[PDB]
């Protein structure tokens, strides 16, 4: 639903690189491989965590809140 905080295999913190990953892809016109290496994810266990992630939270946010303050 949202980017996992840590890598499952080794526990490296990858939850703080989602926005950076998206910025590299969009603004810098970098391919997925270069963006991951730029972010410092060398082990393919970390690469798949960010490469294969699906951001479903954005889809949920389209719905109006059930309770509004």
């Amino acid at each position: 639903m949202i980017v996992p905080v840590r890598c499952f295999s080794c526990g490296k913190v990858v939850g703080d690189k989602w926005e950076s990953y998206l910025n590299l892809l969009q603004e810098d016109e970098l391919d997925e491989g270069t963006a991951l290496s730029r972010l410092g994810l060398k082990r393919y266990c970390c690469r798949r965590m960010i490469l294969t992630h699906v951001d479903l939270i954005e889809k949920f946010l389209r719905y109006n809140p059930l309770e509004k303050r």
Binding site: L25, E29, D31, E32
Partner: peptide, 19 residues
């Protein structure tokens, strides 16, 4: 001997560019 990847996320731009 081939390309075992479904090249995406920049072929859409590639086609949109040459057009």
């Amino acid at each position: 001997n081939a390309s075992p990847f479904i090249k995406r996320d920049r072929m859409r731009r590639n086609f949109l560019r040459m057009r």
